[PDB]
Design a binder for these strands. Structure first.
Ligand SMILES: Nc1ncnc2c1ncn2[C@@H]1O[C@H](COP(=O)(O)OP(=O)(O)OP(=O)(O)O)[C@@H](O)[C@H]1O
Ligand SMILES: Nc1ncnc2c1ncn2[C@@H]1O[C@H](COP(=O)(O)OP(=O)(O)OP(=O)(O)O)[C@@H](O)[C@H]1O
Ligand SMILES: [Mg+2]
Ligand SMILES: [Mg+2]
Ligand SMILES: [Mg+2]
Ligand SMILES: [Mg+2]
Ligand SMILES: [Zn+2]
Ligand SMILES: [Zn+2]
Lengths: 356, 348
DNA sequence: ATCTGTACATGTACAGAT
DNA sequence: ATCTGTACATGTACAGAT
DNA sequence: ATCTGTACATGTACAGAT
DNA sequence: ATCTGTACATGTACAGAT
């Protein structure tokens, strides 16, 4: 009941979806078409809508869209970067419109992202119908972010991605553990889909900095979000409704509210809660473990699970098991103890942050 | 335990599967290769394996294989034949065939026939054509006898025809997303090769959904994991095998059952699987009651003379126009008999 | 004259609105 | 409960290219 | 266009554990 | 008797090479 009302608050409004989507699709079209022009390195790039808005778990407002401009790259070989599972050098065998980004067979991420970014910056300059500018580049981000003032503020991450169609990299052989949940035929079909490499683009100052790419599975997560039940009719017009997405929304909101108040939580992001709930959906595969009348209990066990990840400093990438998003190398003890105490306080005092 | 023992008897042998398949595949690849690699009107024909062997519900022996040679044909107009549901006239290479199903089948049949004659490493002949069949049937003697039905089909890539709009009622079983996706697949037209002497009979084709039935047979649970290595086993296919066996044994003994075929059984269990979508209703421990309610459903179809085509609902497969009332009453007494005496027929 | 990338045309699950 | 806008998959038409 | 190579589904088969 | 784990076999989807 309390949580039913929070969900009502988080529910997007069709009126807002219309206005935001009409603007967003205009810009994204125009950008996509410029990538196709003339002697552009990005000709043939294709569009893939990803993230919460397209999974129907975007909350509060339709004010952040994520879009992938993906480029298929044939005849590619990878060098895993220092056994991290998730980061790769991209190498070319033949000796090519990406030639300007080559650094002797090695494909530079930051060179490629700069050119991409330069092109985007130029196209929005020439947009005069709507109020749109290009955010100052954020370190670690694979994206060129647009700020649209639709009056209302809207962010769009244009994510640049390489598309390889070969089999997924060895480091993912043991990830995506959906066999007892969505099953083996689904797993096989998903792993026949391409995989994607986005620029890591860190500024830490370590070797291969600007030639390191990160694996991306936004497309797989989108499929899973919209096909999330052991039963094929889960959440369908002739099936039973579950509370899996509603639990994701509530946890997303807990993090947003908290992250909005306390800058100690800067190391945390929603992909952390998205990853945690993929594990919970694997742990509890049955649709009856997500009955809408047990929303309280399902949300409480998701919190219990997240707390245990924070305390044990272990939250494995759903697709790359050896990659721990909560390692001390990425988020230190005190950042995690701080969020642990904040969650545990909301848990045990009526979730007062839901009323802000 | 009775029925468990029968299903052991009906189980194909890995050795038999290997020898039949390697001989079948040899023939089919060669016919398929002639269809294109020789300047013929079927140059774009592609192979699609269908039926019980490829759905893993073949029983007793691997001795009957069904193959579809499908041909993409664009911008066809369909016209429904006297509101039959399932039979259509086709209008607009193939110029030398209103696209007459008979005329096209015959050249197709002529091509296979010539090719079979030039096969010298397999004992294979072409069966005499049956009025009623969309098929060119090969008889292979690998010592063991094996039938192959080579089924000519047109492939249309538009919306399924109106008569199916109410068909495929999987919504509460496999769901609306599977139904939508299946209906994005192409649909197929095979020759209605009757002899009845009725009106447009030579130019009529029939809708085929073997490709859709294959997916359903191999994706049959309400849970995605049904019958997978990390899921539970269900006894859905086992019931199909048991009901197919009962019919096969009955037909073998009674000439009165000539009008019945396995497709009747297949259609009935599709309705049952829709009626009882829950995987727990097809629990392996309950194989007996599951089979018995299949029997009871099939007898209710006979009693009421009503067994609608699972994809074309106004097409009654048990209409008087197709199976006489006497034939259905005969099958009813025989099934009721087996049912109430522990299936004596399963021992012979 | 035919060929074909681009974009319209069609249909429907998802979920908000009434 | 029904009505309805957006997203998305797939089929097709045609201006502009060959 | 046409074909092999790859990966894993669907099976059968049998021994050791239950 | 059934269950589990490994071996053994064919079918099928699709990437990539020619
Ligand atoms: N750190 C990350 N590692 C891997 N993939 C990530 C990471 N951050 C984001 N992504 C991918 O990019 C998508 C979009 O990122 P974003 O941060 O907008 O989150 P979201 O899932 O869209 O949710 P929201 O935008 O509502 O906070 C994610 O859904 C995920 O697929
Ligand atoms: N009367 C029919 N109407 C529509 N499709 C049919 C009909 N008869 C057969 N088919 C199609 O052709 C396939 C092969 O037919 P066939 O008679 O070989 O049966 P089957 O399903 O292969 O089983 P079995 O051969 O073991 O009896 C069927 O599964 C179905 O897809
Ligand atoms: Mg987002
Ligand atoms: Mg983002
Ligand atoms: Mg068969
Ligand atoms: Mg047959
Ligand atoms: Zn659900
Ligand atoms: Zn099953």
């Amino acid at each position: 009941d309390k949580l039913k009302k929070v969900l009502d608050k988080l529910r997007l409004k069709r009126k807002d979806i219309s206005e935001a989507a009409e603007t967003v699709n205009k810009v994204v079209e125009r950008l996509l078409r410029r990538m196709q022009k003339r002697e552009s390195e990005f000709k043939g790039v294709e569009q893939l809508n990803t993230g919460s808005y397209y999974e129907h778990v975007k909350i509060s407002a339709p004010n952040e869209f994520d879009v992938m401009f993906k480029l298929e790259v044939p005849r590619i070989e990878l060098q895993e970067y220092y056994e991290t599972g998730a980061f790769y050098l991209v190498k070319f065998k033949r000796i090519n419109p990406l030639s300007h980004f080559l650094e002797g067979e090695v494909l530079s991420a930051t060179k490629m992202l700069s050119k991409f970014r330069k092109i985007i910056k130029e196209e929005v300059k020439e947009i005069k119908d709507i109020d749109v500018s290009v955010e100052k580049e954020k370190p670690g981000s694979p994206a060129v972010t647009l700020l649209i003032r639709n009056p209302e503020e809207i962010s769009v991450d244009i994510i640049l991605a390489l598309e390889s169609k070969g089999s997924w990299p060895i480091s993912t052989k043991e990830g995506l553990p959906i066999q007892g949940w969505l099953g083996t035929k689904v797993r096989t079909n998903l792993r026949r889909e391409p995989f994607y490499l986005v620029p890591k683009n860190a500024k830490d100052g370590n070797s291969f900095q600007g030639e390191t790419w990160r694996l991306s599975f936004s497309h797989t997560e989108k499929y899973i979000l919209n096909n999330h039940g052991i039963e094929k009719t889960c959440c369908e017009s002739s099936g039973a409704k579950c509370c899996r997405k509603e639990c994701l929304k509530l946890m997303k909101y807990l993090l947003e509210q908290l992250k909005k108040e306390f800058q100690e939580l800067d190391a945390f992001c929603s992909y952390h809660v998205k990853t945690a709930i993929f594990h919970m959906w694997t742990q509890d595969p049955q649709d009856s473990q997500w009955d809408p009348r047990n929303l309280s209990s399902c949300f409480d066990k998701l919190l219990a699970f997240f707390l245990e990840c924070l305390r044990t400093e272990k939250l494995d990438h759903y697709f790359i098991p050896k990659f721990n998003l909560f390692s001390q190398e990425l988020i230190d003890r005190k950042s995690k103890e701080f969020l642990s105490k904040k969650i545990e306080y909301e848990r045990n005092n009526g979730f007062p942050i839901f009323d802000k």
